[PDB]
Enzyme design. Structure first.
Site, PDB file in Angstrom:
ATOM      1  N   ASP A 164      21.919  63.132  55.220  1.00 54.35           N
ATOM      2  CA  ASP A 164      21.529  62.687  56.311  1.00 54.35           C
ATOM      3  C   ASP A 164      22.479  63.027  57.489  1.00 54.35           C
ATOM      4  O   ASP A 164      23.019  63.876  57.430  1.00 54.35           O
ATOM      5  CB  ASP A 164      21.310  61.019  56.183  1.00 54.35           C
ATOM      6  CG  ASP A 164      20.169  60.476  56.887  1.00 54.35           C
ATOM      7  OD1 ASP A 164      20.424  60.312  58.244  1.00 54.35           O
ATOM      8  OD2 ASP A 164      19.162  59.821  56.443  1.00 54.35           O
ATOM      9  N   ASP A 190      30.143  46.340  55.496  1.00 58.40           N
ATOM     10  CA  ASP A 190      29.110  46.124  54.479  1.00 58.40           C
ATOM     11  C   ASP A 190      28.539  47.426  53.790  1.00 58.40           C
ATOM     12  O   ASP A 190      27.611  47.276  53.056  1.00 58.40           O
ATOM     13  CB  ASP A 190      27.916  45.283  55.257  1.00 58.40           C
ATOM     14  CG  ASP A 190      27.166  44.644  54.376  1.00 58.40           C
ATOM     15  OD1 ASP A 190      27.408  44.081  53.387  1.00 58.40           O
ATOM     16  OD2 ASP A 190      25.674  44.550  54.606  1.00 58.40           O
ATOM     17  N   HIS A 201      21.342  56.795  61.939  1.00 59.77           N
ATOM     18  CA  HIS A 201      20.174  56.953  61.166  1.00 59.77           C
ATOM     19  C   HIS A 201      20.777  56.872  59.807  1.00 59.77           C
ATOM     20  O   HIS A 201      20.438  56.270  58.997  1.00 59.77           O
ATOM     21  CB  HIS A 201      19.529  58.146  61.268  1.00 59.77           C
ATOM     22  CG  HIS A 201      18.280  58.362  60.621  1.00 59.77           C
ATOM     23  ND1 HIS A 201      18.317  58.949  59.466  1.00 59.77           N
ATOM     24  CD2 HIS A 201      17.110  57.907  60.783  1.00 59.77           C
ATOM     25  CE1 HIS A 201      17.174  59.025  58.602  1.00 59.77           C
ATOM     26  NE2 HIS A 201      16.280  58.565  59.421  1.00 59.77           N
ATOM     27  N   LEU A 204      26.522  46.147  50.596  1.00 57.65           N
ATOM     28  CA  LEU A 204      27.365  45.555  49.444  1.00 57.65           C
ATOM     29  C   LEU A 204      27.121  44.195  49.493  1.00 57.65           C
ATOM     30  O   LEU A 204      26.744  43.313  50.349  1.00 57.65           O
ATOM     31  CB  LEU A 204      28.941  45.520  50.049  1.00 57.65           C
ATOM     32  CG  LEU A 204      29.556  46.733  50.041  1.00 57.65           C
ATOM     33  CD1 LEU A 204      31.063  46.675  50.773  1.00 57.65           C
ATOM     34  CD2 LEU A 204      29.598  47.415  48.723  1.00 57.65           C
ATOM     35  N   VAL A 252      23.785  42.358  55.395  1.00 51.98           N
ATOM     36  CA  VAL A 252      22.699  42.607  54.676  1.00 51.98           C
ATOM     37  C   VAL A 252      22.951  42.857  53.130  1.00 51.98           C
ATOM     38  O   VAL A 252      24.109  43.353  52.649  1.00 51.98           O
ATOM     39  CB  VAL A 252      21.589  43.787  54.891  1.00 51.98           C
ATOM     40  CG1 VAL A 252      20.997  43.269  56.380  1.00 51.98           C
ATOM     41  CG2 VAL A 252      22.351  45.244  55.186  1.00 51.98           C
ATOM     42  N   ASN A 284       6.148  60.760  59.415  1.00 56.90           N
ATOM     43  CA  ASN A 284       5.601  59.967  60.292  1.00 56.90           C
ATOM     44  C   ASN A 284       4.410  60.360  61.200  1.00 56.90           C
ATOM     45  O   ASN A 284       4.341  60.013  62.452  1.00 56.90           O
ATOM     46  CB  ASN A 284       6.764  59.460  61.356  1.00 56.90           C
ATOM     47  CG  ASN A 284       7.909  58.558  60.564  1.00 56.90           C
ATOM     48  OD1 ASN A 284       7.516  58.154  59.455  1.00 56.90           O
ATOM     49  ND2 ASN A 284       8.923  58.599  61.160  1.00 56.90           N
ATOM     50  N   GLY A 326       9.205  66.360  51.273  1.00 57.74           N
ATOM     51  CA  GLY A 326       8.527  65.496  50.405  1.00 57.74           C
ATOM     52  C   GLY A 326       7.263  66.247  49.646  1.00 57.74           C
ATOM     53  O   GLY A 326       6.945  65.724  48.680  1.00 57.74           O
ATOM     54  N   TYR A 348       6.909  68.852  48.517  1.00 54.35           N
ATOM     55  CA  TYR A 348       7.082  69.585  47.294  1.00 54.35           C
ATOM     56  C   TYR A 348       6.886  68.890  46.112  1.00 54.35           C
ATOM     57  O   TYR A 348       7.367  67.739  45.891  1.00 54.35           O
ATOM     58  CB  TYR A 348       8.674  70.261  47.235  1.00 54.35           C
ATOM     59  CG  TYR A 348       8.841  71.328  48.175  1.00 54.35           C
ATOM     60  CD1 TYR A 348       7.906  72.361  48.064  1.00 54.35           C
ATOM     61  CD2 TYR A 348       9.861  71.232  49.011  1.00 54.35           C
ATOM     62  CE1 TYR A 348       8.029  73.432  49.228  1.00 54.35           C
ATOM     63  CE2 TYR A 348      10.261  72.173  49.945  1.00 54.35           C
ATOM     64  CZ  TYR A 348       9.234  73.344  49.872  1.00 54.35           C
ATOM     65  OH  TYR A 348       9.770  74.359  50.919  1.00 54.35           O
ATOM     66  N   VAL A 378       9.659  66.556  44.427  1.00 51.91           N
ATOM     67  CA  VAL A 378      10.520  65.607  45.211  1.00 51.91           C
ATOM     68  C   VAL A 378       9.237  64.259  45.263  1.00 51.91           C
ATOM     69  O   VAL A 378       8.160  64.469  45.451  1.00 51.91           O
ATOM     70  CB  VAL A 378      10.514  66.259  46.644  1.00 51.91           C
ATOM     71  CG1 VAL A 378      11.163  64.761  47.652  1.00 51.91           C
ATOM     72  CG2 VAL A 378      11.537  67.420  46.569  1.00 51.91           C
ATOM     73  N   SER A 412      11.577  57.080  56.866  1.00 54.57           N
ATOM     74  CA  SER A 412      13.073  56.973  56.594  1.00 54.57           C
ATOM     75  C   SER A 412      13.733  55.753  55.790  1.00 54.57           C
ATOM     76  O   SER A 412      14.538  55.680  55.022  1.00 54.57           O
ATOM     77  CB  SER A 412      13.988  57.176  57.864  1.00 54.57           C
ATOM     78  OG  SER A 412      13.949  58.668  58.299  1.00 54.57           O
TER      79      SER A 412
HETATM   80 CA   LIG Z   1      26.295  42.159  52.550  1.00 57.64          CA
HETATM   81 NA    NA Z   2       6.589  65.410  46.310  1.00 54.06          NA
END
Ligand SMILES: [Ca+2]
Ligand code: NA
Lengths: 64, 281
Positions: free
Chosen positions: B32, B41, B64, B75, B81, B155, B169, B171, B174, B221
């Protein structure tokens, strides 16, 4: 509400920006080369413009 | 105090956490835009950058990758979060620059790095409308080598009867992941097609952002790292399961939603996936 611009394919990147900003004046426009890989978040405020090596639009612009 | 984003609960990750399984010792590459390693975190174990002009994979100039990483592995502590697999070994494999884009060779270089460094899981919250033989060869090699490879479906929403799932995606090797909201409704932007495999939460997903921030993002994503995190939870409970087995366990235990063209097999359920015997709920 217009969210795709298939009529812009094959136009200059300049005309595409002008047209999209008339329809969506607060659009966050980013120009990228066609044939790159990009992040897959969906941002309703963004319009990516994928251009060929001549700087013409090579993919249907859409919000996201 | 820590908050558990709704999507982590929705895929039943807390059931694995209560059994004692959190992704420990499972290596997950987030391929990414980098991961902000200073975020309190997150714990980034390693990584590498394939972006020629941005050599530090621990600096995320886009945001991103850091958000995706927090869904995989934020964590387990008293802040921010909680991630799906909060003990996973998280690797920042930077292949996208500040503008959110990368060349196919950069993505392929990142996949090769992940194979060479014995990653157990790859997440690719990324894609494009065309494949290449070299991209296909890279993902196929990762899978042949034992890696669970997960990617965002795309998207592009619908386009009549046409598939709109993007690459990598699209393929077969995947796992392509579409997005649902908290009501299990497909997000309008979520790509469709027979290549859509499973769905996960991808609407208003809270996660980590650079400079010690948090925020809600939308997209396939955001759905993909729920599945990559679920794969890490499953491997932490069953460390000898192959990628084939992890993938089947997720596919075979979804909660089925609508037609598979729009929903694939449905919503993943990591509690059911991580049992020995699998069925849909
Ligand atoms: Ca946390
Ligand atoms: Na696939």
């Amino acid at each position: 509400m217009k969210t795709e611009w298939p009529e812009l394919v094959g136009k200059s990147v300049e005309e595409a920006k002008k047209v999209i900003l008339q329809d969506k004046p607060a659009a966050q426009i980013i120009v990228l080369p066609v044939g790159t890989i990009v992040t897959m978040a969906y941002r309703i405020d963004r319009v990516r413009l994928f251009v060929d090596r001549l700087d013409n639009i090579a993919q249907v612009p859409r919000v996201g | 105090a820590q908050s558990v984003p709704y999507g982590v609960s929705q895929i039943k990750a807390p059931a694995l956490h209560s059994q004692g399984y959190t992704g420990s010792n499972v290596k997950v590459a987030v391929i990414d835009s980098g991961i902000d390693s200073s975020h309190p975190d997150l714990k980034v174990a390693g990584g590498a950058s394939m972006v020629p002009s941005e050599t530090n994979p621990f600096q995320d100039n886009n945001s991103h990758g850091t958000h995706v990483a927090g869904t995989v592995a934020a964590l387990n502590n008293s802040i921010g979060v909680l991630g799906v697999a909060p003990s996973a070994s998280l690797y920042a494999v930077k292949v996208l620059g500040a503008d959110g884009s990368g060349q196919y060779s950069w993505i392929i270089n990142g996949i090769e790095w992940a194979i060479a460094n014995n990653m157990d899981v790859i997440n690719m919250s990324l894609g494009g409308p065309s494949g290449s033989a070299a991209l296909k060869a890279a993902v196929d090699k990762a899978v042949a080598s034992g890696v669970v490879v997960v990617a965002a479906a795309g998207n592009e929403g619908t386009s009549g009867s046409s598939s709109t799932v993007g690459y990598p995606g699209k393929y077969p090797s995947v796992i392509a992941v579409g997005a649902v909201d908290s009501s299990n409704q497909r997000a309008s932007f979520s790509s469709v097609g027979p290549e859509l495999d499973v769905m996960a939460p991808g609407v208003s997903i809270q996660s980590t952002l650079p400079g010690n921030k948090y925020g809600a993002y939308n997209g396939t994503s955001m759905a993909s790292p729920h599945v990559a995190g679920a794969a890490a939870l499953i491997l932490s409970k069953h460390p000898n399961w192959t990628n084939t087995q992890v993938r089947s366990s997720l596919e075979n235990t979804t909660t089925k939603l609508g037609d598979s063209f729009y929903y694939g097999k449905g919503l993943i359920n990591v509690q059911a996936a991580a049992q020995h015997h699998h069925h849909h709920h």
